[model samples]
Target: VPYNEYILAPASRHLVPFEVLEVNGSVTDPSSLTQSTGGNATFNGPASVTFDFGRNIAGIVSLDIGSSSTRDAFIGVTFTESSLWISSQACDATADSGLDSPLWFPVGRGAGTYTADKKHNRGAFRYMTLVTNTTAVVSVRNVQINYTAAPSQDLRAYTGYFHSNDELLNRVWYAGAYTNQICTIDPSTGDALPFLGVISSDSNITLPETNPWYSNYTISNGSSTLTDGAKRDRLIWPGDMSIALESVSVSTADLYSVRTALETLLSQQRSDGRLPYASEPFLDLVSYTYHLHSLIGVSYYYRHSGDRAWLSKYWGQYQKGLQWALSSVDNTGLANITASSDWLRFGMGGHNIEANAILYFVLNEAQELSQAINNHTNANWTKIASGIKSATNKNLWDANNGLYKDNETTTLYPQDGNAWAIKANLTLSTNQSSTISSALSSRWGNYGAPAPEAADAVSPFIGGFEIQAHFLANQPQKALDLIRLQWGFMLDDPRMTNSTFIEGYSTDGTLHYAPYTNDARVSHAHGWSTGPTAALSFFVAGLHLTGSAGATWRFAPQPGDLTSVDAGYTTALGLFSTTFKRSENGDYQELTFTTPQGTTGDVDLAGAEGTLVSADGERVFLVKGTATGITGGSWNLEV
Candidate 1:
């Protein structure tokens, strides 16, 4: 099972394992540092902290990089005699299994840059990583590296975070409370973390904790983004994504566990129903509760699945959270709470538009629960939704500006705020279709299309850099643009360090890197960035059908840019697919949606009728034909 770096065979995948080459170094301040990778842009990665791990003289090499938000770094592998220039995977974007990327291909140009920063072996790898803790430009403290030694040449895959704020449960990979892939858990809560796909008899395994999980970050004077409030590694913002996924199943186990975790987290909740904002050295930096989706996700799941198990097991706990959100309302009917806005915003700022809007969505879920399972029909859920919606519509919306503002202001509107406002409607606004559409096409529009934020919005250090506000705002093109932009930021410049997505890129297209001092040779393979590929398959190709959670519904494609779009993938139930294409004269658009079991749709595309394909290829799979007003279109049936 070990990977051989020299061969193209699957067994060679293990050529490079998680290994750190150096630590405890100082580099030029990133703010004052200079770009070394020879990229089109010139920005330093803070020489204040740097680690070098020799070259990749052997053949193909791979490495992983991880770090706290404050201790950002880069990972590179090189060949001894020649520095291998890292190229972005943009030009040849293709889908590969196992959902990982930046799959290194040979580059001859600036390969020495990688080799010069090599950490461990001669044809192997060397990591040149650096970290800046707090105000200082040096990575100081518990900076550790975990790498494969030259003697073994064993490439048993090793994956973990750079530095977990909390070492207590570092033993859990992907089990960091939410989105652990190695093992599955109730995504709604961070309790009794579970392990799935146990290591079989001869298979080499990789998990979060134990030997391979020995990475930590540095926070100068023991004060920085390195430590989360819970004293745990701040691996993610809204760190509950795994939990959120769990809650989406209409199953109650996730909700039950989420309620339990809330009880524990509540022991630390503030009087305002706000969690403390954290930075480095504090562990759970920012308000961990800022992202209410896990709770809301559970509500959505229940609405569709109507699973009573979740409701029956955790009614009381769910109610407590419901009360907290509802409590934010004042006599006037606004969220009215005094808290920071971003999901993990430290105390530096107070509550903003996105938080309030999402909470409003959560309120609707509570209302659903009251009507379906709970007896709290007259509870705060109804008022919360109504009041918040009313208050926002009245205060936040600006007809003159063509969109909603971040707050009740005439000229101060952040596109993100507006996008969130529109999303709130998509989630809760029953009669605001016109309002949502207008906002999407106007104020938040970017990339020649609708985005969640202004075309120029930017956040340099945010982890999920590829997913912009516009993507969430029902503007897939904007999301697509951002993905393209991120590809540029990561791979465009050879002199600049390369990251698999980015912490965040600026409107000017500048990429600010997070430092990981230990062995700055690799960027950790992430799951969130993988969303683009899936999103494209769903939105761009217009084949949005996932039976992952057991719902068999179709949204039907709206008109799109491409003349034709097709995507097909096998699901648990069966193979599902949908294709959209235009006619010869470009007059009509034809859509073919197929499912394993047969299904039909209203087949009129631009006044042209579409005939059903009733053959064996169309038999096992089902399709819902949506004809987008066909003109001069003809239907051909082959059974």
Candidate 2:
């Protein structure tokens, strides 16, 4: 079937609360909130009720009010992503006040369905507390939430899928898929960034009792777009897009949102070729790495969409942005980093390994884009990227410690830098890559890998990259082990949504994200943290596009300790899929895959032996242990 921009209609639905946690004062028939009808809840002066949707969601709420006993009755509403942060005076904290303003519904009129204003849309939450502070009585028939995430998608209809014998891996992959769906939102309803970057706590600050905040600020000009998280900071952060884009491509294949997100960033590009740290309503924070992420987005978009026109249209700005980044390089052939803003990591300056590694990766990715689209390469880009690799090795690599230092001034070895080092092919030798992998794993605690750069925090954002490093190092078991350890906890924890990944948590298993002081503000459905979704598809299922869309692709499965694997995804070109079934203790196996016709690819056995079946299935094309230039079709390979 031909692919469409969106496969299905909007996933909007009217959801009802399934559980009620608290009731205070003169509240009658509170259990009625969980049912559709048959009974109504009556609230008298200073009464309140808290309801849970059973999972995190983004939307507006409506109430069916039966009657009001007094002329001036009102009910106040507040949202909380977690139960621990629920407060009577406030909702979850978007402001530095440690809580956002509470929402209110007037019940002065007789009987009718009361819907919250569009601006009253809460971006992310699972629990809602409704407090009736008035003297009059208000009777409620039922309460329902109008779910608004993935406004252009068929929410649960995933184009890509992963299945293995290990049930946890499957669940983790699906959770990541759902998390990305929550991260996609209406462009006009993007985060209202009035209180971003300010600082305070609940004891030190207070907000107007009746003045509520809304995420109605338009972050993009597109109809629908991608953002950083479902709850707090529901705006575009280009850095997060680098990770989310890949996961989006493989699972939902929601390229339209991805395209719009990249366009939003390019639209906001400064004249000197610098990009904004995020969408508008945000300061143009100086971030050398995020600037590159904007440029990096172009490569992924083109590769997945194969839209030459969009690439051609944006090529000029892309080159200029690349040049702007190159200009940051100083006398040492390294970009002397000055920006302190990064994925909220600490110590972010001065030839930082993470920044330099990102620059190198972007340069190489740019060269590939240039070659495929423009059919040319700039020697200057080539020269500078090589210099960066050399300089990073000489100045930042701590061979004694088997990791790269954050910078020359610090003795810290950041997880992000070392992971990207292997990911970007900066490591000079196999031993360097393998050693770095072990050194990183050695720092893992029971909760997950600790990002020392973030101070006792386990950032799934960085762990996503770490997963890639292990895969790149041919340590598939190590990568799979980490996924089971970290993501398993994220999924199994009762405090979590159980269907979505989180922004960040402490190494000691607290909900607090390291970068923020107000733990309530931490986002639970962060897109950047959904890395394993794509990692499973690209590395384990082993189907990756090497060129525009699937015009050029590759099949290289690195299944570790599992008996069977099956996965597939759709791109603008068409569907590319693979299925692998193997013996428990031998090389004999059956592998099958399919790609769109007219596309060509190579198959890497990854040190395994295999034979490709001929078109008629009557003959076998024996391998050099590997095959190149294989035409696109569904075929079987035997060992």
Candidate 3:
């Protein structure tokens, strides 16, 4: 759709309040502008007023305005997410940081109203400042936030909820939930959302002129690729979407947008079957593991939706993507490390451990996909998966440190490689898993785990996987702690206005970027940082759909350092919930498990003794075991 022709669906509006923190020249009492309607503030001469919304927001602002003399009215509006940027009043094009210009608006010569919508002037910011040239009285009746989302009925009705003794942990969970909600996109049009307010600065950039690489990629007159971030590289990255699929599945269970995004990328697949890192106006870039993630996404979509027709249509492209990944592997049975933008903090080179581990993961998922479609497993894929696992462990395993080396040569330990290795089951036994688990855990800080080279630097994209790896190692407490410490740190930062997850963070628990190359700017609402949203539902609640289209489900909860958990996920089969309330010392407990009609599930309690189980008020304890199967109803068990 053309950017101008796109008519965005109106999202829910709020009567938000703002405080005028800074001002130049004479301005009327700003406090009177708090009303959602019928409030006006007059500006005299050349004046500007900075209104702090106290939190980050992505939406539009409506100004009810008119000039006293009925002449043309010009106002400079600057929107910024960074509290630091507002204070500094300077931006660096080289680093791609700071607001440079206000979205120039000509209010026109008459008594009328003007509005800035997300499609044209959306921003991720906590601060919105307005500068006017002529004497104008503008009523701040309301600032409607166009979240670019529609709430799912199922998600709103029975979405997962979490609470614990740790206040910070609870705050982080809520923040993550809100972030997941705002990241929602209407895939057909475009994702030109503004996280803060509308753009307000003094630069060449206008409201819709947001894409940094407009002239570079001139296709379709510089239209941006669909994505989730409010600013700075709003491209649909495959690696980022991999994590998004996991988080959104648990949060919303509405996979329509995800399916649309996956199809859009597949439509752009190259003749040789390689998926672009993202849509390009000028170039087609490839990431060794990112392309693999596209296949992973397909497998994930099938498991969640059981949409066989969609899978059948794209199954051929998936094979091509897999083949392209395999072709890059060298004789050493490891994926050769390639260069590109980002993921180069450590100068990753030579048979990269992360690349091979991802390949192993995709191969496993591909094998399952083949079985689903009644097709014979490609012999080469199976062979290569086994070979990569064997070669990766043999070559990169650092027994001395209990972590995989970045490559054959360097002793440098990268969290991305080792964490991915554990996730792929490359580690031999529980002992090896535990050893790597400890080594990875040792890197944890007040915020979260960091790469080996630096203590302060933490990549949430990699850290998110590391958290799941902890759960895979049967270290639920460790996983929970990481979520609390790392994601909690983000929530605790005062600069964070939107209560959403950021792309990265430094040791000080603030926004983070590449320490070496400042080119990689931070995104306040990055989808990759949504690992905790998935972790809470999948790991903490421990409910997973096993068979086709959620034919069967599993109930397992990890009450790590907590007295109880109440959470569940809604699926096509029905709404499933698993709740646990136990003693302070975690000795005795009661578990309530429920499933929809015409469905069955297996309940796996951690430790059960003197156990009594009943289903639909019928005794189901004929077999004395903690694990039991129940059919289509609520069941209560005591342990």
Candidate 4:
């Protein structure tokens, strides 16, 4: 991966030391009180200087040292996430999988000024220490940590502002945006690339590979391809991308990287119509659910890109996928997980309910995709989708429990299957929807939504859909609460350095849960964990794309208990802004929405009632289910 330029521009600043490492040190100018000259620390034999940025920050370090002795003196530099540890083993503070060795800058020479500026792709840390080997005058000045990251232009373009009396909610939203921005890859100068070649994983034993994974991906498009986590396996996992794409699409509105990654994955579809589980290692038989997820990714690509020809070009492959999925179903109309390959862990095997639900969902998406391309709806596709939906409701629906069973045999209810069931509309009736939604909400701990039940762990990837499930089940406030707690936990954790989300957290009792083999080595800046970024803007603010190529959009905010909201997303057409403010007395509601030029909109104010008021300087008739003809103009609505 080459970092040609940074989407997140390189920012430079000198960080002052929070504590002195050695007791025997002469300060050059401890305090030239009124002068502009920077404070300098002079240390003697075996002394070191440590700088803490006060918080965990991402980037590389640069040190400008002016040495006084005429002899060759050496210094050892180390970066750690914890201020307490800086041994040879403490190179990377955020090494999830392996020893994320630190970048050792062995300063050579003693007489002149030595400036060390390099990108140490070691993910996140709060402290940097430099140790001098000999008794020499080490003048420490201009010690800069070049804060590096992918471009933030996309995040900047689509504004999602959250302000409420609740400081935690606001902090959660800000932390989510920051997490997403850092996930963007800067191929050229980024140290997070080529996996273990640069920074080895803790597993030590190199996993066997069929092909060189790095060359398969590129950022030719304006947007940079994203990795699942900044620290661990920097490969592109489609299953992970399924959740990540939402956060990227809603928060950054940058589709180049999305398009590039989707296109690359789509291109990997074999003659049998199976896309690799990921872009790397080329798993011959990868997770079957993720293959369906890859198709789901294609649908998302179509939704955001709205490129008919692109969809048309790959339409046959999608059809191949449909055929492959139909082949996986048993006589009962349920897709057999034990029969076909699926994700290994998270209990994704054995006549899986989630797989069937995803198949049903993609089938509907394929139908719409056909409509979008002006192709006749595939009769068989519609028929199969209906059959699967029926079978799921009949077989998986545990009526007594009011939730879908995790699989055919188990009475356990997993969040992934139940969440997807709601997303796919597999709940038979309004009562079922409400019941299942309530069950899911009840399963949630203070941290966030648990796996299927509270005894299990939580996946931000699946939890992303669960949040959408809350919205679909009309529990918008529940969705907000989950975001505030789960994501808020990630930001508030004192042990973590990077202000980002991880792959999984504990559901039982631990607040910051990191389980599985990589356990503590899990990613902190994973894209899937930034689900709240999209949830806040898309569901909370209710800025949705309802028309073709965004020819007509919608503004339907689920305000819940929040007093106010101001959020929007950027599209190919233009920007859509949705703002809401309620009166202190609760007498009236004020809402403002904007539709880009040449586009129409449907404005659905959730709780606002009464008669038709003036909209955009015009007194218009108001009615539910009616579309508003908008033309790149701002409109004010009062009820």
Go through the candidates in order and give the clash count of each.
111, 0, 25, 21
Q: Distance (Å) between predicted and true CA of 397, model 2? A: 1.6
Provide TM-scores for the models.
0.51, 0.94, 0.85, 0.84
The top-ranked prediction according to TM-score is: 2
Better of 2 and 3 by lDDT: 2
- Please give the distance, in angstroms, between residue 284's alpha carbon in candidate 1 and its true position after superposition: 6.2
Model 3 segments more than 4 A misplaced: 1-11, 14-25, 66-73, 87-98, 117-119, 134-158, 186-228, 338-346, 375-379, 453-456, 508-510, 515-521, 597-601, 610-614, 617-632
- The lowest-lDDT stretch of 10 consecutive residues in candidate 3 is 1-10
> Any residue pairs clashing in model 2, and if so which?
none
Give the clash count for model 3. 25
Error of 4 at 174 (Å): 2.8
Give Cα distance to truth, residue 129, candidate 4, Å. Answer: 3.8
- Model 2 weakest lDDT span, ten residues long: 1-10
lDDT of 4 by residue, 455-490 (tens): 366777777888888888887877878777777666
TM value for model 2? 0.94
Give the TM-score comparing model 3 with the true structure, all chains together. 0.85
lDDT of 1 by residue, 167-211 (tens): 211211111211212112112111110111232223332222121
Q: Pick by lDDT: which candidate is best?
A: 2
Q: For candidate 1, which ten residues in a row score worst on lDDT?
A: 90-99
lDDT per model vs. reference: 0.33, 0.83, 0.63, 0.62
Poorly placed runs, candidate 1 (over 4 Å): 1-13, 16-236, 239-291, 297-315, 341-351, 367-380, 426-457, 460-482, 485-499, 513-531, 541-548, 568-576, 583-590, 595-608, 611-639
Candidate 3 lDDT over 1-639, as tens digits, reads: 111111112224442445767877776756556555545566665677777766556555566564444366666566666565552222212123333445556664545656664444343566777777666544333333444333232324324555556656555655655555555543322333222233223223422333221111111212122254644444466777767776767656657756756776787888888887664431465567667777888888888887888888888899888888888788888888674433435545578787788889899888878987876677888888888988988988889899988788887888887888888897888778878889999867777788764445788888888988888888888888888777766666666654667777676555655452332235677777878777777777777676545666766666677777766666676666767677876744667767776766676666555443546565565233345566666667753
